[PDB]
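Long-time lurker, first post.

We've been arguing in lab meeting about whether flavin-adenine dinucleotide would sit comfortably in this protein at all. Half the group thinks yes, half thinks no, and nobody has a model to point at. So I'm putting the question to the forum: if I give you the sequence and the SMILES, can you give me back a predicted structure of the complex? Inputs are below. Any interpretation is welcome too.
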Amino acid sequence: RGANVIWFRHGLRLHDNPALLAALADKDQGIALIPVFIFDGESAGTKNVGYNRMRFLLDSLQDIDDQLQAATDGRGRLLVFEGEPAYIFRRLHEQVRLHRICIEQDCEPIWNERDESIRSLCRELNIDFVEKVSHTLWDPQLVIETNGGIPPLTYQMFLHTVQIIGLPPRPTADARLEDATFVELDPEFCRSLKLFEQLPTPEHFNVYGDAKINWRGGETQALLLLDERLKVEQHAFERGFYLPNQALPNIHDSPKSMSAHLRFGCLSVRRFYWSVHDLFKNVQLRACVRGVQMTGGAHITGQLIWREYFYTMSVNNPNYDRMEGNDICLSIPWAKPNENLLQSWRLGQTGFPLIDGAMRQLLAEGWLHHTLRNTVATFLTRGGLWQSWEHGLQHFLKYLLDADWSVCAGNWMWVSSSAFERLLDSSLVTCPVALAKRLDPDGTYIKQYVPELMNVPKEFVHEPWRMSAEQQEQYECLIGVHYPERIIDLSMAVKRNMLAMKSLRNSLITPPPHCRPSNEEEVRQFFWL
Amino acid sequence: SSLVAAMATRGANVIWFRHGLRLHDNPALLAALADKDQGIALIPVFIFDGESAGTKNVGYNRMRFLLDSLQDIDDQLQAATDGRGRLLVFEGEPAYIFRRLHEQVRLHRICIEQDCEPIWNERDESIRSLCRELNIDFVEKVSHTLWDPQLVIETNGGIPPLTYQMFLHTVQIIGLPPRPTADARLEDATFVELDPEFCRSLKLFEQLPTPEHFNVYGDNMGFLAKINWRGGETQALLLLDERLKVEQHAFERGFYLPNQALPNIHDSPKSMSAHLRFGCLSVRRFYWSVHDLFKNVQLRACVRGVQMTGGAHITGQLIWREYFYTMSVNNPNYDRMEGNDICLSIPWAKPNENLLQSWRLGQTGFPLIDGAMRQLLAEGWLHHTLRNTVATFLTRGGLWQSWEHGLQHFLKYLLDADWSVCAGNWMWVSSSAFERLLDSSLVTCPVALAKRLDPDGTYIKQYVPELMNVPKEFVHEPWRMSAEQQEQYECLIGVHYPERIIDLSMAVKRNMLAMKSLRNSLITPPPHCRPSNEEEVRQFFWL
Ligand SMILES: Cc1cc2nc3c(=O)[nH]c(=O)nc-3n(C[C@H](O)[C@H](O)[C@H](O)COP(=O)(O)OP(=O)(O)OC[C@H]3O[C@@H](n4cnc5c(N)ncnc54)[C@H](O)[C@@H]3O)c2cc1C
Ligand SMILES: Cc1cc2nc3c(=O)[nH]c(=O)nc-3n(C[C@H](O)[C@H](O)[C@H](O)COP(=O)(O)OP(=O)(O)OC[C@H]3O[C@@H](n4cnc5c(N)ncnc54)[C@H](O)[C@@H]3O)c2cc1C
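Top reply:
Settle the argument with this. Predicted structure of the protein with flavin-adenine dinucleotide, as tokens:
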């Protein structure tokens, strides 16, 4: 008689799951395992959630529920409550002696509230509150400690800091559950506690869907996708170094990316980090990818450090997502919220096809290539529009499949509020024609995602306002009618904003310490230039 | 002076210079000095073979380089010996010169630096064998190359690596190369007083010569635009710090050489190519200054398509050097197309002497080609991307002349012109028929390329001066001018500045076609000197 609980919030996986393991630690003393998930209305980024990420979270629970079953032939499952947690955990500690509560660390400041709650309840009830660090690569408190009590605000720094520290920890053992106990619960208690019998739908949490590809959630599609990119990169690794001739940014590639699986924990990063690191494990690959050296996997590792970069940066700053109250975001003076502009930016009716391609794929699918996160974000902010970033942030945070709080704001702040990196204000990295013309030359993407534009020939599709009236007749696209005339004059805004940025840039000659590109080179790579 | 009679029999060591023109990381020198206690004096000798120090096929520019390069060491010596010791320059025959001098004084050792290039095995052995005869030690030390090429070749199982990739793999088993040797002690060394009659009979120079003494003439097919270089290990050493500094900046600076790390052709005289070519500068020293500067730091940036960390972006360039020399040691047909097991045999079209004689002159009508052949003639040195366009102009990239032609023109007028290095590059660039990318106009055409390397006509006007007046629009592709613009800018195609010699469009298609036409036959490529991959190609031009 006893029971330990693995309580998922982001772990969402069975491997390199250290708290999944601490909870099996006492299998021998007949100690039962309770797989718990709780929809407390905020957890797992379900406070501000669109329909697509919400489908994904249930896939991933669908997965772990299955997994748990078919390893103990229908014995234990995953229990999903819709509830308050500090309150659910109490009742269930009244129904069965509750030994340890096991959790993966959720460093983002916001979970510091919720988590506190039970941290306490355990104190209050004398329950071992188990917290294993495994969502991040390191223990962000060492990074912040090592760098002298404050998280590095620059990529160069962070790197230099985790190079003082060791390499990262390694994926903890595969979890053993074939031989393990399972809490059976008085069915009144289940009904009474709101425990689902049938895993819910978006519809149940009042989330509805208003799509040319899409994403399967969970640890499983996750490990699949890891081996598919692991191969293709061995294939490169092997074939001398090279990656063609096609390690330049293709936007119309598969549902390839593991970004939202990392965001929900479906895939350990320490797995990802090390399955790469191994694969290369020395061998001296003289050759780069995105301007980044590529020997030692240094090119695809780095990406996982970027994720670590922001997460870590955000640990003690709960204003991380806002502008004021936030000491590491420059106070740039964005203009007045223009709900008719904004509504244009969200709907993808701006008249700039690529942005409209990119904004519409976002809604329909919930995921967008790194280069496209750029163009749409710098378009909204400092690429003029010149509208503040907290607006592309609350939008992205809703309709993205990954949309990690720290990460999302991080990239947003970095990209739009670094007034000192002058390369960023160059329309050579801003303008979404001379770049759509590049990223998707035949208008194949644009036409996938902005269909009012099927019939426009490849001469016009990047810039259809060039079309003659007769041509607009002949191709079904009448600007102002079918496709919205440009919502702004870039020439005029581009300059408008530069001058505006210059202004501010000097009105303080010594920048304050903010979150920033580390140098122009790091801008080139962070943009694919 | 007195009983100098004793010292004659008492002994002497020769340190015989040919390449390795330097007093540092010159172990063959330290070798001679190894008997300072025995009372053995040093004899620093250089000799005008007829060949040796690449003098067989020389022009004014390199010849002069080789001399101030010698004036250097000569002073270098007196400098450290209050005029006591001096360098001795005989124009004569090695084996014979040495034999004589031996009677003048006992020789315990004759010390030289190695010379793997097969051309010298004849000259060298001559002495290897003379020492055997007079019971003199023939001392021979490897420097000039990074490694011992025989050990390089030994590892690749007896054949020399034919591909850059294959090369580093090989030298990666064999560890890092030897470190530079200690600085030399000449301050407290003895020297030799020769009988002045003997000095005369052996043609030993009193005053260091002019190129003209060797019937070498500072015309250079009629030329002198300029901004030139000087030889000497001092000069070399000067230039290594000068570049070194910069690198450290890029090193300290968050990696990257900033956006002017793309090739600038109107940069200065900076290149140490001609100094490592004459040993004026130790390659071992170049590599470990770089490798030291970068020791332990991870900086992820490329340059280059080559990583930057651990100096491996600059370190590699001396490995490129290593790659050709070492690949030539045992193949004395290296400079030739036939009898060369490693140069694919390729049906180059008959010599068109009018074509050649215009390629060498810079009268093609395609400026940057003209710009560069004329830089060659004028100055003696050419940027890499430049050597390329002109080599691919002559051979495969329009014109279809054998690479053997370009080679011997290049060996007449290059300040470096290593032998192995030159021919290798020439074959490697012109004869690699299975790398299709080299065929594409996108590295072939000199017009699209002049537009990228020399944007505003700067260079092309510096060197193709008949075109100072064409604007910038028409400067690059000046055949576009109306009859009156030509009247106007005082350059009328034909008169004034050559009408093109070939039809690139027509010729490039032709050439590619034949390269396919060759590629099919012979389905499976015969092992040859070729790039590792298409990515190597990319880094080897700048692209
Ligand atoms: C305005 C803006 C908002 C963004 N919001 C998010 C977000 O909410 N969540 C998110 O994870 N990424 C976000 N990104 C960053 C990035 O575009 C994605 O991580 C990337 O598209 C994921 O696909 P990938 O797996 O092919 O990339 P890869 O290049 O394959 O790298 C693998 C993983 O590295 C990590 N990574 C790569 N780039 C970054 C980066 N710049 N910052 C942090 N981690 C990185 C991600 O986990 C990524 O999945 C945003 C970028 C911008 C400019
Ligand atoms: C047709 C042709 C002929 C050439 N002939 C010669 C020659 O006779 N001698 C010569 O030294 N270089 C030769 N090169 C190679 C190269 O162009 C020069 O080494 C380079 O221009 C030297 O300038 P650098 O010192 O700035 O280059 P760096 O990039 O500073 O490298 C330093 C040194 O590395 C060596 N190195 C660099 N590239 C190469 C290369 N491709 N092959 C071999 N060694 C290399 C040279 O010693 C060079 O000085 C030739 C190139 C071509 C295309």
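For your lab meeting: The longest strand of chain B covers residues 41-48. Residues 1-144 of chain B form a domain with the Rossmann fold fold (CATH 3.40.50.620). Whichever side wins, do check it experimentally.
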